[PDB]
């Protein structure tokens, strides 16, 4: 696959509908902990242990401590130059009547904080809740999300469970509900929102240029989306830190931090 920035820029200059698939690497360049992969732990657990319906069923306080920590951590994190290049791209192209959409698995909203408006968050958001009784989804940026979680969620091994009674965990504020809230994030073993998948398909079907950023095109989630773009003859450009593009078929591979390559690519 080509590494010619000048050739990519020629496609970019003509593209009227860009899909940008954004993976964990974009968030990692902002220092956002993912609690996945080697070394990434919260206390003695990884996300595979806590981001599950079973974990929440048995230990909702521990799961809420985990997500509370991750919410509060965001107060010290900022979008990186990759987020900014992507947002600035959307803004500039939008004034020209050209579409940019970001499809991200990241749940930390740094794309939104950078100014991205056209955003499909396929794994949901740390800053949305869903009521386990009535289903309502709500924005929630409160620090702390409930009083009982103030000062909880410390990540250090040895930290004991807060063991907050479920009545004092975040509760639904719809009139006449009061049900127990969960984070509006996709957990292991769960379905994506079919409505989001429908929106994703529409974008993949109409785009004339696809970028895969901060992840590989041959693993989830990009592997679910990029192949059918490439099948239509649409160029796919990969921006990630792998030395070997674990793939041919795709037109471009640019190695490096997205905050180094994307400002130039999307200028």
């Amino acid at each position: 696959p080509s590494s010619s920035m000048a050739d990519f820029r020629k496609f970019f200059a003509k593209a009227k509908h860009i899909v940008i698939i954004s993976g964990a690497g974009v968030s990692a360049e902002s220092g956002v902990p993912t609690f996945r992969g080697a070394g990434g732990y919260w206390r003695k657990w990884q996300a595979q242990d806590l981001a599950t319906p079973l974990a929440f069923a048995h230990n909702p306080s521990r799961v809420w401590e985990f997500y509370h920590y991750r919410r509060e951590v965001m107060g010290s994190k900022e979008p990186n130059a990759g987020h900014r290049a992507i947002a600035e791209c959307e803004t500039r192209l939008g004034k020209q009547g050209r579409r940019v959409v970001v499809i991200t698995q990241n749940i930390d909203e740094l794309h939104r904080k950078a100014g991205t408006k056209n955003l499909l968050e396929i794994h949901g958001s740390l800053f949305k809740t869903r009521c386990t009784s009535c289903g309502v989804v709500a924005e929630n940026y409160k620090s702390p999300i409930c009083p009982a979680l103030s000062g909880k969620g410390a990540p250090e091994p040895g930290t004991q469970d807060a063991s907050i009674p479920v009545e004092k965990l975040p509760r639904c504020e719809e009139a006449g509900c009061g049900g127990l809230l969960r984070p509006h994030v996709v957990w292991f073993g769960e379905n994506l929102d079919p409505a989001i998948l429908e929106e994703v398909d529409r974008e993949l079907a109409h785009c004339d240029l696809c970028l895969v950023v901060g992840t590989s095109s041959v693993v989830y989630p990009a592997a679910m989306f990029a192949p059918q773009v490439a099948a239509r003859g649409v160029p796919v450009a990969e921006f990630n830190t792998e030395t070997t593009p674990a793939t041919n078929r795709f037109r471009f591979h640019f190695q490096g931090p997205c905050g180094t390559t994307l400002p130039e690519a999307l200028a």
Partner: peptide, 4 residues
């Protein structure tokens, strides 16, 4: 617990 898996890969999403």
């Amino acid at each position: 617990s898996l890969g999403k």
